[PDB]
Amino acid sequence: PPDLRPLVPLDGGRFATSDLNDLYRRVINRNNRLKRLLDLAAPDIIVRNEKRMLQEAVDALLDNGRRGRAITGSNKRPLKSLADMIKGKQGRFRQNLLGKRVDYSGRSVITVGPYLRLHQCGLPKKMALELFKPFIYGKLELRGLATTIKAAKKMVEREEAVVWDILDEVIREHPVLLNRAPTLHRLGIQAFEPVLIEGKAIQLHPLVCAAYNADFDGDQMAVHVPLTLEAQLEARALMMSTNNILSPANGEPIIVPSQDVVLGLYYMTRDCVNAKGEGMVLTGPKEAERLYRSGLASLHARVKVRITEYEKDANGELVAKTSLKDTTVGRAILWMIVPKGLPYSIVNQALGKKAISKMLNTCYRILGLKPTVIFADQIMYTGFAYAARS
Amino acid sequence: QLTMSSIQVKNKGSIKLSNVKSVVNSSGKLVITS
Amino acid sequence: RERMGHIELASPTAHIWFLKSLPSRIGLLLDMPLRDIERVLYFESYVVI
Amino acid sequence: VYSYTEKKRIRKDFGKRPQVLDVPYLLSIQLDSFQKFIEQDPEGQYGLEAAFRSVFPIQSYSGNSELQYVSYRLGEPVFDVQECQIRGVTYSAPLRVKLRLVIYEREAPEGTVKDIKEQEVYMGEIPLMTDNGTFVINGTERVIVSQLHRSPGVFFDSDKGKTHSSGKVLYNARIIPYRGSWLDFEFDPKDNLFVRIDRRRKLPATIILRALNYTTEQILDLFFEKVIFEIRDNKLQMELVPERLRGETASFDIEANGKVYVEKGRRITARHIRQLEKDDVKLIEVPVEYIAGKVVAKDYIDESTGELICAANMELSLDLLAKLSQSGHKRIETLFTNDLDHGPYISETLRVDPTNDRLSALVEIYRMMRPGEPPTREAAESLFENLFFSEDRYDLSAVGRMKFNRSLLREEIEGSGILSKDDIIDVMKKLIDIRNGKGEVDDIDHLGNRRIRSVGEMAENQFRVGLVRVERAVKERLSLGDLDTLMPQDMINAKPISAAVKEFFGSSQLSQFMDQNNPLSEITHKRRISALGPGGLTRERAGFEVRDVHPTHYGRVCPIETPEGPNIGLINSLSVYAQTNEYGFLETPYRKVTDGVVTDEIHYLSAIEEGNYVIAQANSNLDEEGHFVEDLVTCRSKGESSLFSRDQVDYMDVSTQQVVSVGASLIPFLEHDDANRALMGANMQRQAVPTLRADKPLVGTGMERAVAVDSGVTAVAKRGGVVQYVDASRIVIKVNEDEMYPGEAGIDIYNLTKYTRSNQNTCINQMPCVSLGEPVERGDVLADGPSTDLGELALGQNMRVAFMPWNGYNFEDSILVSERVVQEDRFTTIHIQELACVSRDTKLGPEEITADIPNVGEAALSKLDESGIVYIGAEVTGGDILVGKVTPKVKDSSLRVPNGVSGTVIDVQVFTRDGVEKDKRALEIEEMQLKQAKKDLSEELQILEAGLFSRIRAVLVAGGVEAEKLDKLPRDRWLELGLTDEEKQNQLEQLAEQYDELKHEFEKKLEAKRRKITQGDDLAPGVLKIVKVYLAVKRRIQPGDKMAGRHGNKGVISKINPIEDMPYDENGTPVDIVLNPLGVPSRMNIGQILETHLGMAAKGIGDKINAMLKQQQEVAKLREFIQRAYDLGADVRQKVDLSTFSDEEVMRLAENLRKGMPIATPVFDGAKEAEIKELLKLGDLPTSGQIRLYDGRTGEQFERPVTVGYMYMLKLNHLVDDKMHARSTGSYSLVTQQPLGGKAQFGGQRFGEMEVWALEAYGAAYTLQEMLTVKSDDVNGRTKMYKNIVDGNHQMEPGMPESFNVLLKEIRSLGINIELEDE
Amino acid sequence: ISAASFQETTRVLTEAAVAGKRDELRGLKENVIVGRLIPAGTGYAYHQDRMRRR
Amino acid sequence: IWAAANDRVSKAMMDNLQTETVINRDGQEEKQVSFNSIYMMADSGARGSAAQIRQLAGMRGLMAKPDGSIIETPITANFREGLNVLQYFISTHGARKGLADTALKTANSGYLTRRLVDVAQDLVVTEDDCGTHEGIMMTPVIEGGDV
DNA sequence: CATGACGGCGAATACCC
RNA sequence: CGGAGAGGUA
DNA sequence: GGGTATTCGCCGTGTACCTCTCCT
Ligand SMILES: [Mg+2]
């Protein structure tokens, strides 16, 4: 059908080579010549030559270049035949059926959001306004601010304050999918709750970067809006980062802190031989934090701290045991973000990358998924803060 | 991430041979035939 | 974009997919080698029927 | 000694190695190549002269008539570069060639002429190279990238196994002409030689010899040594030379003077052979059966019987030897044959050769060359002659012949462009003896085997293609036509030549849209060497070896600067001192070492000759007498590096920056950076966007001035003089008297480029760096260009940087930027965008540009004039109408501002075809252009008039003083007023005559310029008019933008921190940017740290000088401090003596140094750590480069010292403004109904195969389905989805995607019945 | 369908056309191409309901 | 010999870098884990490793020619001292080799991934328990002398 | 005309009985 | 708006 | 006549995105 082989206008007046209508034209030309020689009863040599030429015209239309010289267009580039339409990377199957361009999608450069929770991403408000546009139109109609479609379109174009309030209402719990190419594993696409931010760059949670193989030296990411209730619930239950903290390849956690978070935890859990405040005996982590913030005790000071830790019993209740621990001020301070049920020994050491990963493993094994996500976010906040303070 | 003589035991433990036979020897130490 | 056309060919023409794509379906179906089919179809020889 | 201009700001050089050779003109390759192409060459060796002499004379088939080339010339271009860029036309010169048609007398004795028609003929436009090595093609600036290709000649290669059995090395040779068929010879696994012409099917090698009129015995004589068997009575005794028998075992008891030396069963060794020095035995008896494994070489016949007893080259047997002996044939001819060094490859090839004479060889060659064609003896006899033996169809170039003779160890360098018999024979012999383990194969990637073709050579090649295409038509029209009185213009149709040249200059792979982000990008583009293009490689197919840094790249090709990704190792950067030789091979300079003394004599060595010498490193300490201070110098000898004594050393490197490219040479502390990050930094230096204010690098290498000057972006004084006038758009220099030609005023006018878009929509703006009355010398920078500061390349800004983590905002290479950087517009950049509005001729009616637009309010058209065109200076925003246009459907087709492109209208251009009534805005634009052009012929008239009157004043008061006649007689009465002549005004008759010629030059071209302004330019067919609107937008720095240093330390800004939140020092000074230390250790780009330290030191010096300027200290105090600053260093080469500077010069230099003293640290002769700490001490800064920082949020001291200094940071052309994009719904494709692609088309993101795999792995079937249908080509599904979302019903009703239907229709069109089944 | 969409589309389609092959939409790629719910994850039950109704 | 020298330089650098002296509670010297920033980053595992540290402050070590043969003379300098022209040019061989290796291996990895995806695309968990008794025998993987 | 890619694999070819 | 060529980003 | 080593033609060779010119 001709609408599947259109003629693309170039500057209106002239058309580019379709590369498919040309082969059809050659086939028709040779067929007409063979017909006008068939009724003519011409000598058999030229009739046979025309039959042969019609044959190469036909098999060039079907599969150009499969046998013999590849029939050439105006430029030396071979003509694209019918077989080329359906095969190869640019063929129909791989370019339009196994993958395709989609609506309700965008992309932008990614920057680090260190304040974000694991389930949140930072979405520019202009991108959100464009992406969620039909939802905005629906909400505008719902509360009567826009009588017609055009009224809602004009209000969104003018970017009125009530439009921004409606946009805030729509995206409150509507997850979005963030993707970074190459998508090497399912975790290359993950769901996040968007938070409206100023600027034009998408903010990414640090702990998911390893899953994306993402960094912030120029990386760009695509965002997609799950439209239907089924898609939204699939994003929340199947693809949300807080539900996908384990690698499907080996079962190990993917959200282990790296770089400056690890540096901060290591620095605050290191011990110094003659640090300020050494030998002090503290009522608990709160006193350690008070002494550190007031400058009366060094972060690496070896001290004695009364620590109350919790251990699960046979029936699963948290039995509390309180004891005096020989530790550091920084380890006691870090103990405050450790959820109940983990032993104090998990922090009573210089915490490197492997130690932090083991701590997250212990938290996941003992307490489950939600406390693990909360613990990971708290660890990342503490690591950032104390790496900065160091 | 992918990039395109004589045996010695190094730890304490008992020795076990499988698919092995015991035969007379010149020095008394078993040869292997399988 | 749904309605197709047809071209009534003045003479019969062989489909290249069923000729060149190895194994030659015409050649295997007839046991005449692909070379002879190529020469006859492309007017270099004759076949007795 | 320092000139007045360079006294303004002297960069402190820490370089210690003296500079023996200046950095050459960085654009010399392009200019020299194009000059060779276009300049007149009387010898006819290069360019257009050579191409014409190689296609002319055009002779008829009969030969009655011939067309003779006389000479050529290039006419004046119709438009200059600027007009060509404005009008969108190619900047080219007309080629006007003097031809002469000669018709001879019909049945003349020989060559008698009957007419000679000599005429000049036009053969098309030749695009001219600009002053900066660029071309203007269709109004766009393009660079012709030089190509690195395999040299023509003979190349001997092999396979190291990898093809058959195990470890069977197959050798081959390739004769590669510059023009013609490729001739290949190869060994098959059974040791037969095969020959291939143009990569066809392989034929036996002896076929080529048979076609060269060589018989079997002649071939055997060529490729074998004759052994003779001299039978006297019986026993088959054998005459030989001893040497032959060495290596193989003893077949018989060899006898010496009748006494046997070695018997059977013992292999002959070396001592055996040496014993025969005094044992000269010639006739040796051998067994009869020994002859069984032998070959008869000659063709033998009996005395008179006439029966062919044995022909040449056959296996001798007992029967054959016995019957040949019984006829008294006393001497037997055999071929010497061994198993390791004298293999019978030719004999076996003959044994498998089907051909047996010249006719058979020629017909076989015809069958191979032209498969499916039955050939006449004449046809083959002409085809073979045309393959390699006709100048017209085959051409080994001069470099090809040179390489061919050099590979075969021929003394002669010059030779013929076609192959001879001896050429092929010697190629085969060298291939055989390489197989025999006597020679070695060649290195394909060796730079002595890969040569350079630049713009001139490829332009000449394409011109030759056009010339031969025209020659065919000329010959057919000449022979077949009954020509009489016809002029040579009739035969010459210039369309083929013009088409070929335009194709080369507009569509060739090496004709590339110029990278014009900054001057360094231009320099790099003009200096790239490409292995791609025609006759080269393809990036999909190139292997590891050709992408590797070869040892011959040293000093010729930069090992650092190469693109990341697919193009790695295929696109290279010319080294700083590298240049091509006459044959196009890259050569690099070296200092000759004579008698252990490093002289200053410079020899340029190519890769071939460089490997024959011992070359000392540039990092080799010398003394005042030139001797090497040490006795064991590190040197390169044969692609290897070791130690040698000074007497062994033959050459030394001229500079420590010899191996690197310009971009790599601009990286300070390059030697402390890992090569990967150095590559990244060199690549990203070219992506830096020129900022609002050009800021010099505090830490530089010394190459910045050369880059800025050689780029051509700056205004450089052609002649010395004094700045007579200066403003933001123009500089007028009053030339010095000693630099004046006799008949001139001595006025140089430099018109500055102001706010013009680059090829990447960046701002090109020139601003003067000289003041009124300033003295200027030749070569001095008069006006800075984009990213240039006082003639120094200034790609970025000096940023006060602290290395510490800051609350995650620098995590994973993220960058924290203070709001003070935003406030000071440090990285604010100007971007100029060109929008076009085209009124065409529709079928219904002609499109109209007017202010009358329907369905739009009056307020929305307040920015348009009465002609419907936006005013100059209007502040437009996304959606605003620039040019109001209506189509007679009238539809609203007005050119609007693209969304979020809010900017300022700075220029409006109107182009109207002949016969179209130009509008009122067009009329007033025309009026402004007319007034400006009259001004360009009046102000440039009166300034030159003032200069001429100054010269007339000087001459008139010299020997002809007339004080009263100065004022009682004006300057208009010295020309015609009648009086007796004398010395007073006879000289004036030569100086005011040129004045009167400016009454004949400026005024005479006024009408022509008026015609050009009033000209109705030729537009595209159907185009009524074109309105070009130029929008200037200031992009301020924001999160999401990409910043980088020169060390490969790249990142994206994550946050714009308030000034009170930034870390600050004890003096309350906050840092500008916080970089993460953790990106330093694994990257191993330590230079960024050292530069930072050095940057701090540099700023410290300025911080003192500024203080001395704020306290108004004595000039002596500044002299003392600045002299101490320049004297600092460990025996640096630079010497700055402030005592020779005047007080005013010292004050000016101190003013230019108050923001920080520029430091020069050459890439491999840079500042040491001790020197940096010394400079830090001089500025009263800590030697560790680390200071105490406080948290702005809390005032708490950071627990450890933080590295704080100054790093030179670049804003890359990767702004988040250009990259952010979002789409809910929009336009869809035609064939598939899927959303369009690209931000420019407001397209949707592609959810590709791996994305679908991720969705499948999650089990998110509904999300995947909506990706496939309601968000893509399900037309009904997407409409229902949109309506449901508006209704608040988040439910889809997916249908069949249209792409599946398209696939079904396509398969059906292939004659295959594909259909869906029932439900 | 899956083989043709993978590689050697000409050969695979020729084999299918000569043999008169019939493709039941049972795999993930097949259902992706025709834009249906994949027989996995949340769509799995749907396909089960499609299978049990025949 | 050069490999042993590189090992000795690395050992000396790590020994001097990993430990620092400090005054105890009493006026007595004591050894403790160093607070050097680069050492802290490496030991914590945040960034860097032994190889990178010895490239920064030890010596770069033995390099390889493009064909893969090891160059006889190693780079005795480190990045803090700075390389000379010869050492830098030598190191560019390995740098270019690694970058081109990544560039040309990403395509092979993608092709292998696509082939694996196709061969396994249709395999879905369709049952809770098929009732099979067969299984594979899992032992610890031991090559001899290590686990 | 382009002549710098190469490994794997199956049908066809030739060689050796 | 389809194709080709060139360059670039991750 | 039939089994097997060699040859020849076909198949395949990462994703996403951005910029420019030029094209019956
Ligand atoms: Mg990255």
Q: Which residues of D673-709 are buried (b: 16+ CB within 10 A; e: fewer)?
A: bbbbbbbbbbbbbbbbbbbbebbbbbbbbbbbbbbbb
DSSP for residue A273: T
* Residues in binding site of F for Zn(2+): 130
Measured in angstroms, the resolution is: 2.1
In 3D space, the residue among D408, A91, D1068 whose CA is nearest the CA of residue E8 turns out to be A91
Q: From the CA of C22, how many Å to the C1' of G10?
A: 9
- Residue D1236 CB-density burial (10 A; 0-12 exposed, 13-18 middle, 19+ buried): middle
Separation of CA F78 and ligand 1 centre (Å): 27
Non-local (6+) Cβ contacts of D462 within 8 A are: D500, D501, D503, D504
> Please, do chains E and B touch (3+ CB pairs < 8 Å)?
no
Most F CBs within 10 A among E28, E31, E32, hence the mutation to make, goes to E28
Non-local (6+) Cβ contacts of D865 within 8 A are: D851, D871, D920, D921
Please, are residues A215 and A346 in contact by the beta-carbon 8 Å criterion? no
- φ/ψ of D878, rounded to 5, equals -55, 120
SS (H, E, C) D1274-1300: CHHHHHHHHHHHHHCCCCCCCCCCHHH
Partner E contacted by A98 (CB < 8 A)? yes
Non-local (6+) Cβ contacts of F23 within 8 A are: A273, A274, F29, F30
Chain centre distance of CA D531 = 10
Partner C contacted by A198 (CB < 8 A)? no
Run of H or E residues at D104: strand D92-104
Measured CA to CA, the distance from residue A173 to residue A135 in angstroms comes to 13
Partner F contacted by B5 (CB < 8 A)? no
Side-chain-side CA neighbours of A310 within 13 Å: the count stands at: 13
Please, are residues D907 and D919 in contact by the beta-carbon 8 Å criterion? no
Contacts of A4 in chain C (CB under 8 A): 1
Angle between helices F85-120 and D1249-1258 (to 10 degrees): 60
Contacts of E44 in chain A (CB under 8 A): none
Separation of CA A246 and ligand 1 centre (Å): 23
Angle, alpha carbons A68-A71-A75 (nearest 5°) = 140
Partner A contacted by D811 (CB < 8 A)? yes
Q: Taking CB atoms and an 8 Å limit, are E27 and F118 in contact across chains? A: no
Give me the residues near ligand 1 (ion), CB cutoff below 5 Å. Answer: A 215, 217, 219
Determine the residue of chain D that is closest to A61 in CA distance: D1310
Amino acid at D1316: L
Check residues 18 to 37 of chain A and report those whose beta carbon is under 7 Å from nucleic acid strand H.
19
Structure tokens at D1047: 């060390």
Run of H or E residues at D328: none
Run of H or E residues at D475: helix D455-480
| Cα–Cα separations (whole angstroms), residue F53 to A387, D438, D1089, F47, F128 | 21, 49, 15, 10, 52
DSSP for residue D871: P
Element counts in chain C: helices (H) and strands (E): 2, 0
Residue of F105, F108, F145 lying closest to B10 (CB–CB): F145
Q: Which domains does chain D have, with CATH numbers?
A: 25-151+444-574 (no CATH), 152-224+343-443 (3.90.1110.10), 225-342 (no CATH), 575-655 (2.30.150.10), 656-712+788-827+1036-1219 (2.40.270.10), 713-787 (2.40.50.100), 828-916+1017-1035 (2.40.50.150), 917-1016 (6.10.140.1670), 1234-1319 (no CATH)
Amino acid at A38: L
Non-local (6+) Cβ contacts of A275 within 8 A are: A297, A298, A299, A300, A301, A302
The number of residues making up chain A comes to 390
The partner residues of D13 in beta bridges, in order of sequence, read D1160
Run of H or E residues at A165: helix A161-170
Measured CA to CA, the distance from residue D953 to residue A164 in angstroms comes to 76
Contacts of A224 in chain D (CB under 8 A): 1245, 1247, 1267
| Three-class secondary structure of residue D202 per DSSP | coil
In order, the DSSP letters of D498-567 are: HHHHHHHHHHSTTEEE---SSHHHHHHHHHEEES-STTS--TTT--HHHHS--GGGTTTB-SS---SSTT
Q: From the CA of D513, how many Å to the C1' of I11?
A: 36
Task: Name the residue with the least CA to C1' distance from nucleotide G5.
Answer: D541
Structure tokens at D399: 């470099």
Structure tokens at D536: 């080269």
The partner residues of F29 in beta bridges, in order of sequence, read F23
Measured CA to CA, the distance from residue F34 to residue A3 in angstroms comes to 74
Run of H or E residues at D8: none
Check residues 74 to 103 of chain A and report those whose beta carbon is under 7 Å from nucleic acid strand H.
75, 77, 80, 90
Separation of CA A219 and ligand 1 centre (Å): 5
Angle, alpha carbons D586-D591-D592 (nearest 5°) = 110
**Strand D450-453 to D1221-1223 pairing:** unpaired
| Cα–Cα separations (whole angstroms), residue A43 to A47, C40, E25 | 7, 19, 54
Separation of CA D1222 and ligand 1 centre (Å): 22
Q: From the CA of D239, how many Å to the C1' of I6?
A: 43
Torsion on CA atoms A33, A35, A38, A43, rounded to nearest 10: 10
| Cα–Cα separations (whole angstroms), residue D896 to A10, A152, D653, D1219 | 21, 22, 59, 21
Q: Which residues of D325-346 are buried (b: 16+ CB within 10 A; e: fewer)?
A: beeebeebbbbebeeeebebbb
Q: Taking CB atoms and an 8 Å limit, are B2 and F109 in contact across chains? A: yes
In 3D space, the residue among D668, D660, D610 whose CA is nearest the CA of residue D639 turns out to be D610
What's the distance, Cα to Cα, between the start and end of chain E in Å?
Answer: 23
Contacts of E17 in chain D (CB under 8 A): 1312-1313
- Residue B21 CB-density burial (10 A; 0-12 exposed, 13-18 middle, 19+ buried): exposed
